[PDB]
Amino acid sequence: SLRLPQNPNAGLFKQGYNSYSNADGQIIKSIAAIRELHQMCLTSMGPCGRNKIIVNHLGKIIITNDAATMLRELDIVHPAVKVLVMATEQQKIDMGDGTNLVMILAGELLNVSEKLISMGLSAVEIIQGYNMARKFTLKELDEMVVGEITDKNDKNELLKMIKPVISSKKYGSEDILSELVSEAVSHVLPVAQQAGEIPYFNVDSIRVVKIMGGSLSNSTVIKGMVFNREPEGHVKSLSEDKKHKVAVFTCPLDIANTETKGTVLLHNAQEMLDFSKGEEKQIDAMMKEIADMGVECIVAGAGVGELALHYLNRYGILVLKVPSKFELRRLCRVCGATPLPRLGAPTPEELGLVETVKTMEIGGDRVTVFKQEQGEISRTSTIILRGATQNNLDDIERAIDDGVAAVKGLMKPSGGKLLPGAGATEIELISRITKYGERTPGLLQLAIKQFAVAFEVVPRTLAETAGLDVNEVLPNLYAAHNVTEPGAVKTDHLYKGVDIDGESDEGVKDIREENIYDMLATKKFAINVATEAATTVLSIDQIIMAKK
Amino acid sequence: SLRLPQNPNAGLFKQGYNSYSNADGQIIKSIAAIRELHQMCLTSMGPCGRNKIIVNHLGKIIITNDAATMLRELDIVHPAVKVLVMATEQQKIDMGDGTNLVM
Amino acid sequence: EMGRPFIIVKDQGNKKRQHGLEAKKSHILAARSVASIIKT
Amino acid sequence: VVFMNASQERTTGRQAQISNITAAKAVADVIRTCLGPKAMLKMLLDPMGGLVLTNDGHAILREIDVAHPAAKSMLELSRTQDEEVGDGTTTVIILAGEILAQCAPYLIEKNIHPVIIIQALKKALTDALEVIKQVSKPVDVENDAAMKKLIQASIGTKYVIHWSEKMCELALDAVKTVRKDLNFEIDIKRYVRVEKIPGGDVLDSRVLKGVLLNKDVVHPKMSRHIENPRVVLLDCPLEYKKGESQTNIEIEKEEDWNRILQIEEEQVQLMCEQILAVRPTLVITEKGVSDLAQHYLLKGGCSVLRRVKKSDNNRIARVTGATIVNRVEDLKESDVGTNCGLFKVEMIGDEYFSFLDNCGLQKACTIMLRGGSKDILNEIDRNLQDAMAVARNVMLSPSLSPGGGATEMAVSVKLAEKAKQLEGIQQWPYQAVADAMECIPRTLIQNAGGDPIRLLSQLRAKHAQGNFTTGIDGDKGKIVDMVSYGIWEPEVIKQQSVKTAIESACLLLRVDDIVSGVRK
Amino acid sequence: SLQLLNPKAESLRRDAALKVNVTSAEGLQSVLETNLGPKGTLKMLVDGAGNIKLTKDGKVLLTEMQIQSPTAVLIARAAAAQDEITGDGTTTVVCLVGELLRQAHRFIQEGVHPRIITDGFEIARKESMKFLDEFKISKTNLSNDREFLLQVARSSLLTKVDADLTEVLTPIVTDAVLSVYDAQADNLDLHMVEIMQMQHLSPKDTTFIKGLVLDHGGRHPDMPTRVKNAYVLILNVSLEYEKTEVNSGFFYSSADQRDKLAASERKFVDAKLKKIIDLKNEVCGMDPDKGFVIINQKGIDPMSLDVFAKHNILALRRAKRRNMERLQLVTGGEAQNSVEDLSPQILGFSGLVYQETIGEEKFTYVTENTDPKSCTILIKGSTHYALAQTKDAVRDGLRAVANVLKDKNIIPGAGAFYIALSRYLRSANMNKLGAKGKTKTGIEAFAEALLVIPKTLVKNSGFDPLDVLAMVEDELDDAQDSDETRYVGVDLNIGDSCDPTIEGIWDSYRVLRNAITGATGIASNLLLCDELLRAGRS
Amino acid sequence: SLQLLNPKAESLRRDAALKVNVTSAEGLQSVLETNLGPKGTLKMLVDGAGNIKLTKDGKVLLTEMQIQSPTAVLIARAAAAQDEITGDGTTTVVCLVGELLRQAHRFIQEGVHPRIITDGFEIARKESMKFLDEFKISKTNLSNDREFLLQVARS
Amino acid sequence: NFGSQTPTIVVLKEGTDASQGKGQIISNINACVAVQEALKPTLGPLGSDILIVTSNQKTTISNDGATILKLLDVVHPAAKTLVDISRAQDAEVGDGTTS
């Protein structure tokens, strides 16, 4: 009576092991544990979303509203939350778009499941309710698609794709951020129309260089790569033009050394007198064949000795240091050169072409300009990003990568397949699934009807973060979808969406004039990952943890 | 395999209670325990018997060969010895002779 | 304070701040202690 | 400085609303298994060591220490239901806990202000009382056979349902004895005496009108069996009275000290002569009795009982009709107890028991309960008080309402028709009460092992046919109406359960901050 | 969800608390099952102070040993309440509660809900009460035969000590009643016998006395120890005043009043003694062999001892409260408070009064009465535990012979009643069911659980309980078709059956009736408790 | 008598040891009781390093979670070795060992010696092998039926 | 089920601060104003200077908004934004870091 039996025969496992089952409200606590980090990403959704500050153990601060990036530095405890954390990371890697949607949608499916479990629905019937409703959801997305990108590159058409994606990440000015990203995309496109070749694109081609100081309006697009480097021998503006012939060597420039026990052997004083002048003639003979080919610049991948740098300054040859690997790999894609390990005369067919190489002060240090010109187009262009704070420079770099990842969505599928934005995609699916729930007899209609209720978070989040009442604005939006379709065709009511601030009362007419749309390839995987993320949590009846 | 199950009965009664039962001990084991005090009385028996010095917690020393007097001033934790101690107390109270023979 | 620790700079309680007339009086008296040593 | 020394840090906003709702839901979740005829039992451990095993809602809440400040308000809700009525303390927390559980996705989701919800909860409370009044039907309050089936409503959940046939006869004569004509019967639990005697059989019991005392007789010659007993209550002790003035007597002559002891013996004999004027057969006092006053009453045959409980003397005056008088000089034949009979002292090894049987309408009764163990006997005591509390509201008002899932669902159906007709901002919080009334009938199915999905789906379709008597069976879970089995409960129990849940929900929804460290 | 209410609160729900009720009851039963039967084990209770207590009864064991497990506390309080009214059945109830849980726990793992299990217990228990009326045999107590009371009283003593001391104590507990009876009033009180604790002779040398024995000796040497004719005068007033109620003092002007004020207190003492001396000589003066004895409940003035010493009057002080009622029944006198009213009619009579000196104390013996209405039992022992072991054996033997006079029906023992309930509860047909397949589950668990009593007896004897009960079922099958009623018992000597009526073993009516009803409620509430919670403020 | 051999030692025998094998195997079977079956529960294991193991296989539960009770160590090594050769039967052996101990424990309390109980296990098991010959159904691989391999794989 | 404790799972690791409520964004405003309090008297040709001694006992006297913020180690997340704009203004133009 004084002390409990304290769970007898519990010595079967270590004291750090704990057993948590769906019974005793722990499945409700798991859903309640999602709402702790769910509300964190709700205020970050949309163009009015609020960025968050997360300080790691090393002191690095990353300010971003992206749900996939924020969950990286955070230490997660509850096991089922890691299911939601790792679900948002896959969406960022695969499609590079729709990261905040997977975080919010998978969290709302568990919130509406709390009422489903309370009514007595078994975990098996709840899973079958979402799987049957998701298959009908993916089929309706292909029916509601409007418009297409058609041609690969266009000045106007690229403003309907990258611009609405970067509007949510660091909104700021619209046309300023859209022109910087859209310019670098046109350079890496092979074009070659009417040739019938298979298009190709690389998400790592466009590189963002973070340079503090200045303003966002002073940013520009550089066709070449930009690094922080100090020329060794001399600096040259290269005003003599006629372009240049450039060679790239992944191996360092120095006398070839034996990999085992390199040692100077001198038997007599006769060999010692010619040893000092012997090494000078070796580099002279090797660098003479390069200078005879008209090579004004040499890219090195490792440390170069001083004896090799002497003859490079005699013929006026620039010296570049390219540490590690990936930095040197993208340099040859600009000039179209093929590296070779030997120090001999390169092949004339493997030499690159760079018209001008300039060194100027941007952020206070010397940077080298690889920028190309109209002719002899180059690939893997870089975007100079100027900003006052380094924290803004980090997320804008990821904001540009979101626009670069949107270009990848124009390659694998048949087209762009634009969808209505401003939350109009998830709202139209509500009326379609509601009619789908009635067409299916049985007890499975409870999970199907509530599956469409979870889509109401998108219009409520955009309305709440905009400083508007969700009770006045949201029911007024259903007035366009409550009139169904008239006796005549050409119905534009599908373009209605949620507006931020302004005069409220719905507004912005039809979004067709706003040009903001969504990607169909993004919404396909955003719903599948978010559904499996909530299904995994509901499919686990018992959770076991260790050490805590 | 590192820790024992501790038995379910560990929560029953208290940890201070100790149990000695058949096949659990006793059974001529505890009988061998009283042989230490039994040999004490064997050396004190007869006219050649040896007296024993006992110092109580109070400090008073009582030197005698009487088993009833010696076992009275000794604090003994073993309970079954008190069965033999109380048996010798009756010999001194009633008859007053033969206390060494009883033990 | 509102109930949360407010630290602008590391070693908050370690460093001290002087301002106003008291900051000027401590600087003049610091020189007067050195002056009277050198004046002798 | 530190400014405020009490909770200088503050938790406000949605974080404080979640902590109030989550803690309130945990109070109702533990008692979900405590509802229904198949309900389980809960054992509690106090720091004193006494074990309390019961399924009652109030007994579980008050014996558990909750560290959450707002969850303690849920603990005191059962006290409101227990003190005013005493039945239905479990359904109050389940209903109040479900309201806040259903009202949670509003401030977080719909962003509706609490006062806006409060205005909807008050309007839904008025409409809920009208639905309960319409489904209630009057019955005869003077029918003994009808009141036996009404007491079985709260017995069906308790373990005493096996003795329910015997238990109804014990609780029926207990309420009818203490009630009197005057606010109608104005019956009070203080007049009903429930004595707990360890050992015996539960099947063997009887309602005894009188006071059962555990005190023995003060003298062996005292007759333990009297044909025509006469009870005279005296608050003054038979011992020699000493003045509080601390009188000090200075003795000079040799005959002064011997006279003091004689006068002390003369007054004790004098006080006995004042008692013998009416010649009582019995004497009962609440204080000690001296050994000198015992012999003077042996000639008159006055049986003296000492150290009687103070509240028991008021219960003796009701059955015996005697008037309590402190001084022996005011004793008259009118103050002597009359009409009492069957005075006998039964011999039991544990204690000596005294019996009384009655032949100014206020009476009293002592129910002797014989259990199998002291802890089970404590359960029958609690079950007997809840059984007598059901008959109280039946005698106060003729109104009688259905129960067992019929009343809770009858309100939710009426709330669904008016909700669609509101068409306003209050439509969302008005629908929360309709889904909140569903927890009680849903809990009865989960404890019975049935499927709440298919039963509650067809249950709502039955109430749309115009009959409010459709309940939920506790054993088979049938949709058969409650008129066949006969479940009925007073309307006061249904009203006090709904009123308490609505008033408690508005209290916790208005708390936007939780601070501690005040130490008043 | 309990930790949200309090951080330090713990609970175990559903099967987590179910394993506790089954294990804690099984663990407590395993310790006390070895004490059931005449061959049962003997426990030695040793506390921190060094006290040794040898008893086989579960009432003393559970009282001295505090139980930490909350589940076994219900069993301890149930076995304690069983010992209060019936004075017997402590070990029996403990063995039944733990067995009812284990038998019902086997069906719980099969998917059976505990609610229908409790239904099978109440239905089968009511049928056992109806069989109890037909199985019991009414006896005629108007003859007051010794042979019937010796066999019933011996059966209770065989479960305490060996057969050597049992044969000595059997006529003692049989004589514990004797002259105490009432035909019409039915009132029977066992509190009139006195339990004396002293070390004299041997525990097997004790004897029964036909009159009251007191522990107080003669305060003065000249008081005659042996008195042939004594008139007991009950005096409840204290001859020596302890204090005066009203605060007072003596103020003397001259030293001549000091001895006078001291003599002032001598008048009140002599006033009470004046009427006592006149009462002795009132009957007859100068009469030898006729003495006078006073038994006082309060203290007696040592100064007044010489007043009675000249008259050869024996005085006793500091008597017990329960001793006053016993003086009226034994000596036949009447209780008197003061000396104001005296007479030879209210004085008692005794044929022999003597005192013996044991150790440093003297005990008073009173016997040889005409129609004594009360008696005493002298319990002697050779050690400390011998007084406690014999007392627990007598007190448990008093309630056994009392139910014979309270209830003329006697139920045979030796497990014959538990075996008879086995075959009766197998098939109830359409008599009492209430449900299809729901009730029959709890009845089968209650029927097979009643067989633990005969099996536990065999296990303590070192035999096979399955082989003993195998021959029992074979005899009951042939006895039904032979038109002969036979009661089959359990013999622990040769490991065979027997007849409880022939062997002399019987059980009380109130012990077996309260054991089945008491153990049913304890086991039912534990099966209906799915959660064990602990909360409170330290 | 072990306290005389070693200064500090722990031992449990007879009724103390009888509750070791019965109760410890009961808590281990209860963990895998909800595992068996296609509708069985799904368990997730999270260690202190951050790794996540989500599976219904009873072998992962035994290898990842340490067991202090020595009784289950014999069962864990038996359940693990069953999945090694036959790829199946981890949760089956645990349900057989844990239940057979409890089914035979009721007669141990009745006074039946454990040896004659275990002797009946071999007699009953050898009959399961003789019955296995008539219980099994022969399948000819010369037919190359694809539907037969589909239904077996779905088990 | 493995123990009577049954701990409650916390979403975030122990040691994490809190947020939302009322005044969380206000805490970031008062952090920048307090840093501004030191740089206000340093503005203008008649302004004063600030003496700062680090943990290494290195005496430095600076009125420059960029140099003052380099001496002190700012652990406040929002207050470090004033350090970035002070170093960015000093890198390009070099003047106006205090303004």
CSV table of C-alpha atoms in Angstrom, one decimal, chain E residues 400-525:
chain,number,residue,atom,x,y,z
E,400,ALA,CA,-15.5,-23.7,17.0
E,401,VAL,CA,-17.5,-25.2,19.9
E,402,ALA,CA,-19.6,-22.0,20.1
E,403,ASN,CA,-21.2,-22.5,16.7
E,404,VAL,CA,-22.3,-25.9,17.7
E,405,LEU,CA,-24.6,-24.4,20.3
E,406,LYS,CA,-25.5,-21.4,18.2
E,407,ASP,CA,-26.3,-23.6,15.1
E,408,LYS,CA,-27.4,-27.2,15.7
E,409,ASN,CA,-26.3,-28.0,12.1
E,410,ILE,CA,-22.8,-29.5,11.8
E,411,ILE,CA,-20.9,-29.8,8.4
E,412,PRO,CA,-18.4,-32.6,8.0
E,413,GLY,CA,-14.8,-31.5,7.5
E,414,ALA,CA,-11.7,-33.0,5.9
E,415,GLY,CA,-12.5,-31.4,2.6
E,416,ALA,CA,-15.7,-33.3,2.1
E,417,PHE,CA,-17.7,-30.2,1.5
E,418,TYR,CA,-15.4,-28.8,-1.2
E,419,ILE,CA,-15.3,-32.1,-3.2
E,420,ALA,CA,-19.1,-32.3,-3.1
E,421,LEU,CA,-19.4,-28.9,-4.7
E,422,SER,CA,-17.2,-30.0,-7.6
E,423,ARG,CA,-19.6,-32.5,-9.2
E,424,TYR,CA,-22.6,-30.2,-8.4
E,425,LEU,CA,-21.3,-27.2,-10.3
E,426,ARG,CA,-20.2,-29.0,-13.5
E,427,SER,CA,-23.7,-28.9,-15.2
E,428,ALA,CA,-26.4,-26.6,-14.0
E,429,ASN,CA,-28.7,-27.5,-17.0
E,430,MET,CA,-31.5,-24.9,-17.5
E,431,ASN,CA,-31.9,-24.1,-13.8
E,432,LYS,CA,-29.8,-20.9,-13.6
E,433,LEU,CA,-27.9,-19.5,-16.6
E,434,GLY,CA,-28.8,-16.0,-17.7
E,435,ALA,CA,-26.8,-16.2,-20.9
E,436,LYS,CA,-25.6,-18.6,-23.5
E,437,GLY,CA,-21.9,-19.5,-23.0
E,438,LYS,CA,-21.2,-16.3,-21.0
E,439,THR,CA,-22.1,-17.6,-17.5
E,440,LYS,CA,-20.8,-21.2,-18.0
E,441,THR,CA,-17.3,-19.8,-18.3
E,442,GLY,CA,-17.2,-18.4,-14.8
E,443,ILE,CA,-19.0,-21.4,-13.2
E,444,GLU,CA,-16.3,-23.8,-14.6
E,445,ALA,CA,-13.6,-21.5,-13.1
E,446,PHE,CA,-15.3,-21.5,-9.7
E,447,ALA,CA,-16.0,-25.2,-9.7
E,448,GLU,CA,-12.4,-26.3,-10.3
E,449,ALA,CA,-11.1,-23.7,-7.9
E,450,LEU,CA,-12.8,-25.3,-4.9
E,451,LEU,CA,-10.6,-28.4,-5.2
E,452,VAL,CA,-7.5,-26.5,-4.0
E,453,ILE,CA,-8.5,-27.1,-0.3
E,454,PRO,CA,-8.3,-31.0,-0.5
E,455,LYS,CA,-5.2,-30.8,-2.7
E,456,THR,CA,-3.4,-28.4,-0.4
E,457,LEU,CA,-4.0,-30.8,2.6
E,458,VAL,CA,-2.3,-33.7,0.7
E,459,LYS,CA,0.7,-31.5,-0.4
E,460,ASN,CA,1.5,-30.7,3.2
E,461,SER,CA,1.6,-34.5,4.1
E,462,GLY,CA,4.0,-35.3,1.3
E,463,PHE,CA,1.7,-37.3,-0.9
E,464,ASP,CA,0.2,-37.0,-4.4
E,465,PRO,CA,-3.0,-34.9,-4.4
E,466,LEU,CA,-4.0,-36.2,-7.8
E,467,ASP,CA,-3.9,-39.9,-6.6
E,468,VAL,CA,-5.9,-39.1,-3.5
E,469,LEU,CA,-8.7,-37.3,-5.3
E,470,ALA,CA,-8.7,-40.0,-8.0
E,471,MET,CA,-10.2,-42.6,-5.6
E,472,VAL,CA,-12.6,-40.0,-4.2
E,473,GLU,CA,-14.4,-39.6,-7.6
E,474,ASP,CA,-14.6,-43.4,-8.0
E,475,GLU,CA,-16.4,-43.8,-4.7
E,476,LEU,CA,-18.9,-41.1,-5.3
E,477,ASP,CA,-19.9,-42.7,-8.7
E,478,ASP,CA,-20.8,-46.0,-7.1
E,479,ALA,CA,-22.5,-44.4,-4.1
E,480,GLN,CA,-25.2,-42.7,-6.2
E,481,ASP,CA,-26.5,-46.0,-7.8
E,482,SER,CA,-26.2,-48.0,-4.6
E,483,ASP,CA,-28.9,-46.0,-2.8
E,484,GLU,CA,-26.5,-45.1,0.0
E,485,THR,CA,-25.4,-41.7,1.2
E,486,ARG,CA,-21.7,-41.5,1.9
E,487,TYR,CA,-19.4,-38.6,2.9
E,488,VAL,CA,-15.9,-39.1,1.4
E,489,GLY,CA,-13.1,-37.3,3.3
E,490,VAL,CA,-9.3,-37.1,2.9
E,491,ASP,CA,-7.0,-39.0,5.2
E,492,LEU,CA,-3.4,-37.7,5.4
E,493,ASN,CA,-2.0,-40.8,7.1
E,494,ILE,CA,-2.2,-43.7,4.6
E,495,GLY,CA,-3.1,-41.4,1.6
E,496,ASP,CA,-6.6,-42.7,1.1
E,497,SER,CA,-10.2,-41.5,1.6
E,498,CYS,CA,-12.2,-41.7,4.9
E,499,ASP,CA,-15.5,-40.7,6.5
E,500,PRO,CA,-15.4,-37.3,8.4
E,501,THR,CA,-18.3,-38.5,10.6
E,502,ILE,CA,-16.4,-41.7,11.6
E,503,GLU,CA,-13.0,-40.1,11.8
E,504,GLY,CA,-14.3,-37.3,14.0
E,505,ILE,CA,-13.6,-34.3,11.7
E,506,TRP,CA,-16.2,-31.6,11.3
E,507,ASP,CA,-16.2,-27.9,10.3
E,508,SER,CA,-18.2,-24.9,11.5
E,509,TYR,CA,-21.2,-23.5,9.7
E,510,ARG,CA,-20.3,-19.8,9.9
E,511,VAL,CA,-16.7,-20.5,8.9
E,512,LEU,CA,-17.5,-22.2,5.6
E,513,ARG,CA,-20.4,-19.9,4.8
E,514,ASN,CA,-18.3,-16.7,5.3
E,515,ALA,CA,-15.3,-18.2,3.5
E,516,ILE,CA,-17.1,-18.8,0.2
E,517,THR,CA,-18.9,-15.4,0.3
E,518,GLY,CA,-15.9,-13.6,1.6
E,519,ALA,CA,-13.4,-15.0,-1.0
E,520,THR,CA,-15.9,-14.4,-3.8
E,521,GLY,CA,-16.1,-10.7,-3.3
E,522,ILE,CA,-12.3,-10.3,-2.9
E,523,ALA,CA,-11.6,-12.2,-6.1
E,524,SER,CA,-14.4,-10.5,-8.0
E,525,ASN,CA,-13.2,-7.0,-7.3
